């Protein structure tokens, strides 16, 4: 499975969108997810990480 940061931010405002982005950073640090950004300012894609073998959309 995977999750797109940009879809998660669709109906958010600036402060909510920043918090979701920040949480991608936090969740990566905890190895809950893996992260992928093809190029600068493209979508960022979250993949399951080693220290969390649940469902991905549970974190979000």
């Amino acid at each position: 499975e995977s999750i797109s940061l940009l879809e998660l931010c669709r109906n958010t405002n600036r402060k909510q969108a920043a918090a979701k982005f920040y949480s991608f950073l936090v969740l990566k640090k905890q190895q809950a997810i893996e992260l992928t950004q093809e190029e600068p300012y493209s979508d960022i894609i979250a993949t399951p990480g080693p220290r969390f073998h649940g469902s991905l959309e549970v974190l979000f």
Partner: protein, 348 residues
């Protein structure tokens, strides 16, 4: 005058080849607690000529990824900066670690440090004075300087204190040919000091007004000795909103903070660098004004300077157009990487 992007290869925790940016006019660098953000601050300092001793290492080679624990990832490392300018081709400034020594390059031609620095100077970037940088705790240090310490600081930025040793030498040489000898060094020091001081004093009220968003606030800078200002304290008086006119010293708390900020921003509005790196200034801020400073940065970034802020507080960095988010990847050594996120695509 624009820092478009930074490119790093195997510098500290930035393993491999990595692009940082492109930067917008107001960019915030953020991330959870790690070495990543401060290593990026060091990469910027390093590409702009910083000495090894200010980079938290003992030898240059120790800046190569993995080198501190004897597992270097390569025999070289580099940081480069792309500087863009309307009407002109991009100029790339790079510093490479090669054989334990620094190699400087402009557009892939090797150059000596003297030329690297001269070329940066022509762009407004004073690498020895570090005019582009607001270090951590800069607000607090300003807020503590008394009138004479404020004069010391102006002698530094204006480089008039360079002439301070000859001023005293020719003053003893005086007590007819020495009258002219002293009046010339007196005039050089004075014109250096006053050119800086009067720009800062001119700009400080508008800055103090912009920071505390209502127009009732006012701020003033006057020498104690208006003839030879370098020989006496610099007075700094504020009319904080609602309070009557007072010396900045006699202020208190979150308003002395805003007055030191205005003096700090005012000092930098003289011969300003095209970009301004603010390392965690939002740390010494309350929820009473952090939003206003962030709005002041946002406003200034559309015209006066590019703003690059390293920020811990969402009430600050949500005002950026662009976020660079720093994260760790697990490995032998700490590894950092970045993400870029456009905030302008969302309302507030």
């Amino acid at each position: 005058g624009f820092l478009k992007l930074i490119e790093i290869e195997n510098f500290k925790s930035y393993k491999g080849r990595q692009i940082i940016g492109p930067f917008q006019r107001f960019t915030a660098i953020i991330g959870p607690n790690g070495s990543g953000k401060s290593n990026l601050m060091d990469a910027i300092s390093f590409v702009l000529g910083e000495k090894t001793s200010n980079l938290r290492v003992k030898t240059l080679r120790d800046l190569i990824h993995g080198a501190p624990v004897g597992k270097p990832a390569a025999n070289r490392a580099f940081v480069s900066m792309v500087y863009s300018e309307e009407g002109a081709e991009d100029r790339t400034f790079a510093r490479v670690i090669v054989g334990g020594s620094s190699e400087y390059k402009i557009n892939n031609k090797v150059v000596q440090l003297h030329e690297y620095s001269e070329e940066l100077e022509k762009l407004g970037i004073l690498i020895k004075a570090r005019n582009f940088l607001v270090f951590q705790g800069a607000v607090e240090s300003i807020a503590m300087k008394n009138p004479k310490e404020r004069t010391a600081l102006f002698e530094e930025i204006s480089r008039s204190g360079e002439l301070a040793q000859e001023y005293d030498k020719r003053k003893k040489e005086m007590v007819k040919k020495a009258k002219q000898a002293f009046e010339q060094i007196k005039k050089e020091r004075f014109d250096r000091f006053n050119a800086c001081f009067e720009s800062v004093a001119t700009n400080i009220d508008e800055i103090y007004k912009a920071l505390s968003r209502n127009s009732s606030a006012q701020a003033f800078l006057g020498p104690e000795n208006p003839e030879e200002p370098y020989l006496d304290g610099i007075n700094y008086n504020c009319v904080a909103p609602g309070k009557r006119f007072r010396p900045m010293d006699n202020l208190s708390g979150g308003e002395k903070t805003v007055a030191a900020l205005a003096l700090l921003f005012a000092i930098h509005s003289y011969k300003p660098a095209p970009f301004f790196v603010l390392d965690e200034i939002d740390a010494a801020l309350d929820n009473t004004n952090i939003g206003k400073v962030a709005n002041y940065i946002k406003e200034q970034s559309t015209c006066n300077f590019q703003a690059i802020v390293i920020s811990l507080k969402e009430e600050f960095y949500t005002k950026a157009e662009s976020l660079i988010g720093v994260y760790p990847e697990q490995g032998d050594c700490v590894i950092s990487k970045v993400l870029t996120f456009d905030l302008t695509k969302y309302p507030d």
